[PDB]
Each structure stands twice: as C-alpha cells, then as structure tokens.
C-alpha cells in the first residue's frame, strides 16, 4: 500500500483510545521510528481502571513514506503472529484520527546487546555486577530465543532482522524478540524474493539472501547463529574488524567467525551448523530448541 493515500481501516479489537494513553520518557530512537514509555489506562481488561506501563512506537517528525509503511507492517505482522512468551507482546494501537501509535509490552531491562555488555565478567557506569552472566544464563538466553523463533517459523513468518539489537529483556529476564518491521508472511510461497539491494544488515544475512535473493526460515536460522555468537561474546559485534564491503567475498570463500571465549565447542559447532552453506543442512528451529533444551537440562542438572 502507498501510504500517502492509504487510510488505515478500523480494527476495533486492537484499537486503544488516545485519551487513555499518556506518553512518557523516550526509550529509543532508531532511524525509522522512535519508542517512548507510556501509561495506558485500562489496556489490561482484568484491571480496567489501572494504568500499566507500556512502550509506544511512533514516527519521528522527519519520517519518510517507507517509515510509515514499516510501522504499519510491523503492527500487522504482530497481529497475525499471535502470542508467545518469547515475542514482545502487542497490546494495542491508536490508528484513527491522528498519529499511528503501536503499543507494545514494556521490557524494563532494555535491548539484549547492552544487557549482556552490562553483565560481563570483570570505566562503565552501566554495569550490573550483581547480575553477571553465567554459562547457564547464556544457554538459557539462547534457548528462549530459539523457542521464540520456533514459534515464529510455525506461523510461517520470517523475521529477516534477527540480532541482539532487536531483542528486549523484561524485568524477570525473559527474552523477547522485537522489531518486526522487516518481517514477512511466507505462508503458501516457497521463499521470499529479495530486491536487488535489501535493507537487512549484511553481517546477519544468510548467503542465499546475499547472492541468490532468496529468504526462507533457514535464512533466519543463519541469523540466529550470528545472534548466538553475539550472546556468547556477551554483546560483541560480529566479524570484528571486517567491513561489510570485504565480507561478501570472504563469505563466498567459506569464512566463518571464530569460537567465542566463553563458549564450549558443543555450542560453537551449533553456531557453525547454523552457518552451513546449504540452507537445508542447517538445523531447523525445532531441532535447535531440542538440542538447547538438552544442553540446558544438563547444565541446570
């Protein structure tokens, strides 16, 4: 839909009244949208006079048409995806007679990369030493995210932008996949066809997307492997020292990232399996969940 003449249809089951929403302090500014904390009175049907803290995604003053298209697409993707423990929860939207607000559950511990970096083993005033990550914590993080993606893939949707920056962490340390603005519905098609030059960060893109312009669930599996590497480096950035302009040829030559310091060979081989050159030889998200559960069960004892 061309947003400059598209009028958002009514969808009463998701609509939230503007007079019940009080916008608060900013939580983030990316480039296509901005997210603010807010108080939503009555958005929990079970506590109808109660104000609950939420996060609201909206356009910036300098928004483009594509920014608005992405915000609509993110809202519609979250509607169709449905509910899961490891997917950030869509609560409602203000869509009629004013700016588009997409209202989502608030994750008080912020994005995953900064959450991990603040909990690294020993000047940063943002560190949280009382919550330093153990190996079991890292495996648990990975397992939760694999469960979220297993659910996502069972809904026949591809995220396409999986990365630590697009994961949120709640007060109870629950991992929440977020930022569905690039996600797509691939029900009834065999693969999603990429344009010539996409809007997906190159360092998380599977080679078949990069070079053959195709995206499947197994392309998300590749990105999940990079996400795993981010987790087990406690928020490191991938292919360190390699600019994206040099990475294309390195990937064609079979280059893969080295093993992170805090990782077992078992977990590194799981990353490497996610980075198999042949998409159908990478594990599925169902298989990753099974393997991570077994590792996590052994670790917790």
Numbering used by the authors: 461 to 582, 588 to 766
From the study:
Receptor tyrosine kinase (RTK) signaling fulfills fundamental functions in development, tissue homeostasis, and metabolism of metazoan organisms. The FGFR subfamily of tyrosine kinases has emerged as an excellent model system to elucidate the molecular basis underlying allosteric regulation of RTKs in a physiologically relevant and unbiased fashion. Our data reveal two clusters of hydrophobic interactions, termed ‘DFG latch’ and ‘αC tether’, which relay allosteric signals between the A-loop and the molecular brake. These hydrophobic networks, located strategically at the interface between the N- and C-lobes of the kinase, sense the structural fluctuations in the A-loop and molecular brake and undergo rearrangements to determine the kinase interlobe angle and hence kinase activation.
The multi-site design of the allosteric network implies that double mutations from two sites may work in conjunction to push the kinase toward the active state. To test this hypothesis, we engineered the following double mutants that combine mutations from two different sites namely: molecular brake and A-loop (E565A/K659M), molecular brake and DFG latch (E565A/I547V and E565A/L617M), molecular brake and αC tether (E565A/D650V, and E565A/M537I), and DFG latch and αC tether (I547V/M537I and L617M/D650V). The activities of all double mutants targeting different allosteric regions were higher than the individual mutants. In fact, the activity of the E565A/K659M double mutant nearly reached the maximal activity achieved by A-loop phosphorylated WT FGFR2K. To provide structural support for the enhanced activities of the pathogenic double mutations, we solved crystal structures for the two most active double mutants (E565A/K659M and E565A/D650V). In agreement with their elevated kinase activities, both double mutants crystallized in an activated conformation displaying an active A-loop conformation, a disengaged molecular brake, a weakened DFG latch and an engaged αC tether. Note that reminiscent of the A-loop phosphorylated activated FGFR2K, the molecular brake is completely disengaged in the unphosphorylated K659M/E565A double mutant. Note that the A-loop in the K659M/E565A double mutant is in an activated conformation. The hydrophobic interactions that the K659M mutation introduces to support the active conformation of the A-loop are represented by semitransparent surfaces, and the hydrogen bond between Y657 and R649 is shown as a red dashed line with the distance given in Å. Taken together with our extensive structural and functional results on single mutants, these data on the double mutants further support a four-site long-range allosteric network that controls FGFRK conformational dynamics and activity.
